Design a protein around this ligand. Structure first.
Ligand SMILES: Cc1ccc(NC(=O)c2cccc(C(F)(F)F)c2)cc1-c1cc2cnc(Nc3ccccc3)nc2n(C)c1=O
Length: 256
């Protein structure tokens, strides 16, 4: 639950930078072995007791969410600053990985997005709405093991129309984001709606227009992105339906 700072070694290089924290790679001593971890060090400049409350609440939320397809919590550590200790996904975000590894097979991409649907089906079942599902928020443990993470101005290009218009956030608006995620993945981490303003994307979507099928993307997978992009929220699938369609496809295509 609560970790001993003496058992925690921090590297001075930053994996992430933010207004309320700095992420650093570390090592947590465990009897015989040492476990590589990612550490959010609370930056409370600031200087409120509610910021610490938020970190402790996130820790409680994370404790409840236990699934192999989400960045899992190791524990909390109170030292020079408050620290949240998480497992390390050594390859970093899915977008950057794919921009540098054009050799990734489309069979390997089906497996990754299915794993993302599995973790999102879990979050849906636990009544948890992500709100920032994108490729940059999918971190790789290995090339065959994806984990969902969550690191004013909004990520409009991943937003469902009911989020832009009425601020209605649900698991079904996370489904829309999943479809933008799938597009980013088969496009080898290229930016969705490249060079468009958020306002331009809203207008395009209202004309019934959607992003084209990436090069080499299987047709069944593009058909699924399009169903994730259903304008009417009531007709849009949930993650139970999405995961089941990806599971079947993985069972058919990837078995070997
Ligand atoms: C350090 C850290 C603290 C907290 C979180 N939070 C979550 O993952 C989270 C919070 C709420 C909901 C959910 C959801 F349930 F939806 F999943 C997740 C994440 C981190 C954290 C972990 C992490 C793991 N690996 C890497 N790898 C990496 C490698 C190369 C370059 C960049 C990153 N990075 C991580 N980072 C940056 C983290 O912040």
């Amino acid at each position: 639950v609560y970790l001993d700072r003496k058992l925690l070694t921090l590297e001075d290089k930053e994996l992430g930078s933010g207004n309320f924290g700095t992420v650093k790679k570390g090592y947590y001593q465990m009897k015989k072995v040492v476990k590589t971890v990612a550490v959010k060090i609370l930056k409370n400049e600031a200087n409120d007791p509610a910021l610490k409350d938020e970190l402790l609440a996130e820790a409680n939320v994370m404790q409840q969410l236990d699934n192999p397809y989400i960045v899992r919590m190791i524990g909390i550590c109170e030292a020079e600053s408050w620290m949240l200790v998480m497992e390390m996904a050594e390859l970093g975000p899915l977008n950057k990985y794919l921009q540098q590894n054009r050799h990734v097979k489309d069979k390997n991409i089906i497996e990754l997005v299915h794993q993302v649907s599995m973790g999102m089906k879990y979050l849906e079942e636990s009544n948890f709405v992500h709100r920032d599902l994108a490729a940059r928020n999918v971190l790789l443990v290995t090339q065959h093991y994806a984990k969902i993470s969550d690191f004013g101005k909004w990520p409009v290009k991943w937003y469902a129309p009911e989020c832009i218009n009425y601020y209605k956030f649900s698991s079904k608006s996370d489904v829309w984001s999943f479809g933008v995620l799938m597009w980013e993945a088969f496009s080898y981490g290229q930016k969705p709606y490249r060079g468009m303003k958020g306002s331009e994307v809203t207008a395009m979507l209202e004309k019934g227009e959607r992003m084209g099928c990436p090069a080499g993307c299987p047709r069944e997978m593009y058909d699924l992105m399009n169903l994730c992009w259903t304008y009417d929220v009531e007709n849009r699938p949930g993650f139970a339906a999405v995961e089941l369609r990806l599971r079947n496809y993985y069972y058919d295509v990837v078995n070997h």
